[PDB]
């Protein structure tokens, strides 16, 4: 079932992680995708200059994730999302996307 | 309840990830710890010179994880694990441990 993971790694103004994280309590339709299995939003411990928040998403296939990226619900979730280069008031400093095959999983 | 994540990031000789990942199909007792919630073992996509394998573990608390680190089941799991510096035949070149608070999670 859980075969592919996509991560968005966000670099944020120090101290703004809690505010960004609370936004994830509200669904925007990712849950409607048959291929979507789950998500974790993490804050990296022991960071000096910036906060780091990772959004980890777990999928039945790479295709489920690639379709999501192109979907209306992805657009809806990210409609009002701006990075500092687009809106100076945004705490989002940098973003990188990393993808993975999940070779083994076990949820207790 | 998934409040803490610990990651072991392994840098491996290119082409050896499959062999290493298969080892994780065998449990060594981590599942017996109340504070353990689950694990994923991933291979990073698009890596050029080395394979990258991550072991992600999800816990009810940091204490659950640090207790496991010094536990007998940790030793049982890692008893016959060697890196290249200890045994040149090992494809395990380097390791880094990263820890995280989990601020939000949802499994569909
Ligand atoms: C690349 C630049 C990105 C930025 C700056 C960003 C930031 C954000 C923010 C702030 C939210 C919360 C929206 C709100 O409720 O106000 C959100 C939603 C979300 N993001 Fe992104 N994100 C990016 C791309 C990605 C990627 C590649 C993934 C794939 C893992 C991802 C995963 C998610 C998920 C799962 C949600 C909630 C979706 C839903 O509930 O329907 N994000 N993103
Ligand atoms: C940093 C040095 C480490 C290396 C080189 C390493 C490598 C390995 C290998 C090769 C195995 C498979 C053993 C087998 O069945 O033959 C294993 C077991 C495992 N490793 Fe590690 N590991 C390290 C530390 C960690 C850390 C910090 C974590 C925490 C996320 C972790 C998570 C796990 C888990 C959950 C298992 C299976 C435990 C069980 O089933 O009881 N490892 N490790």
Swiss-Prot record, chains A, B:
It catalyses: heme b + 5 AH2 + 4 O2 + 2 H(+) = delta-staphylobilin + Fe(2+) + formaldehyde + 5 A + 4 H2O; heme b + 5 AH2 + 4 O2 + 2 H(+) = beta-staphylobilin + Fe(2+) + formaldehyde + 5 A + 4 H2O. It comes from the Bacteria. Its main location: cytoplasm. The record marks 68 as: Transition state stabilizer. It holds the Pfam family ABM. Fe cation binds at residue 8. Keywords: Cytoplasm, Heme, Iron, Metal-binding, Monooxygenase, Oxidoreductase. One of its GO terms (cellular component) is cytoplasm. Residues 4-93 form the ABM domain. GO terms for biological process: heme catabolic process; iron import into cell. It is found in: Cytoplasm. Heme binds at residues 23-30, 78. GO terms for molecular function: heme binding; heme oxygenase (decyclizing) activity; iron ion binding. Allows bacterial pathogens to use the host heme as an iron source. Catalyzes the oxidative degradation of the heme macrocyclic porphyrin ring to the oxo-bilirubin chromophore staphylobilins (a mixture of 5-oxo-delta-bilirubin and 15-oxo-beta-bilirubin) in the presence of a suitable electron donor such as ascorbate or NADPH--cytochrome P450 reductase, with subsequent release of free iron. Belongs to the antibiotic biosynthesis monooxygenase family. Heme-degrading monooxygenase IsdG subfamily. This is Heme oxygenase (staphylobilin-producing) 1. It comes from Staphylococcus aureus (strain N315).
